[PDB]
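FAQ: What does a ligand-bound record look like?

Like this one, built around zinc ion:
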Amino acid sequence: TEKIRNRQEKIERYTSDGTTIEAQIDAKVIRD
Amino acid sequence: IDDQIQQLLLKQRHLLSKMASSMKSLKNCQKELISTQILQFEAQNMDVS
Amino acid sequence: QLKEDINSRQSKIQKYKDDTIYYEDKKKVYLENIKKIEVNVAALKEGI
Amino acid sequence: GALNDNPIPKSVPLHPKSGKYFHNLHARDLSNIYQQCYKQIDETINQLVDSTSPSTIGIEEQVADITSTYKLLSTYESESNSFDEHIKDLKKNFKQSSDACPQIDLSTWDKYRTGELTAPKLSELYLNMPTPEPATMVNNTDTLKILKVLPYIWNDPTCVIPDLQNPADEDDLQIEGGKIELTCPITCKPYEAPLISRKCNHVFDRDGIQNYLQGYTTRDCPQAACSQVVSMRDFVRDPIMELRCKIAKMKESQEQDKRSSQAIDVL
Ligand SMILES: [Zn+2]
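The answer part, i.e. the structure of the complex:
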């Protein structure tokens, strides 16, 4: 039970982190 | 200028053919690498089991 | 950075969801076992 | 049958440690490389229009060769896409079958090694995995539109090709016979950054089409006998018109340079 609790916590944390970094990268998208 | 340009376009088509061949190698060797990678995974699965 | 973020997110979420399913099934099995041993305890107390 | 005195089983179900390894098993995303290729080919198209002397013929073979090349490259991308899709489906099926197969312990070790227990083998299943096929060949770029129509456009730049707006259908685009105007129907000016309408295929200069639609959200198509109600968003860059006008202007520039030089020799 402690193991699954840790796994769910980390899943939510890293899902939020992945979404945030994805948005950051989309911002990061952007001679003669 | 015209003929030098036509030579440049011949270079375009030739180097494009080179790109197509190298892309064949690209995709095929990517498939090959993941093939041996999944083989490694199977061996490691058997190992940990 | 997008490549690294996607790889890290996928890997971690996979590890933790696999562990979630695995240890949840283990929890269910242990609950079944404790129910069986509770039945055994009840039978032994009845014998007492 | 020769049982496995080699305790390595012929096939085993997905061990969780390698279940994690299996999660990392995927075809690499090569779509970025293909986008780089497609951008390079578009620049090649633009520079091919820029350089090629409109008085000199012989670009049909260049365009046909790059057409075949880009179709081949799109085929490779599609092969990789279908390979990744097959990897995903194969992974799903292998996980389902392996989890349906008993996990590995000493008893199941002996059963799996002796063939008593059989589980999907990712090596075997990967061999049984469907071969990478062209899945959604990337032909919908403007790249294949020009690589297909440019021999004929070189033969006659002003020809109307009405099916240049749908690269999504991979059937060969039948070019209908026609001639696209070299002057904007609105401003009576040659196209500079021409915008084509996706509704009627009438192409107008960006300044001209903006002026015709100026002051109103949507207005009818400026071309004669066309009632298509269009707006700025309804018009998108027309590479074909830029190619035609560019070629025509370069031919006129060569003619004008020769004429202007002799025009000065007169004085
Ligand atoms: Zn239209």
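Follow-up question: can I read anything off the structure? Yes, for example: Residues D 197, 199-200, 202, 221, 228, 230 surround zinc ion (CB under 6 Å).
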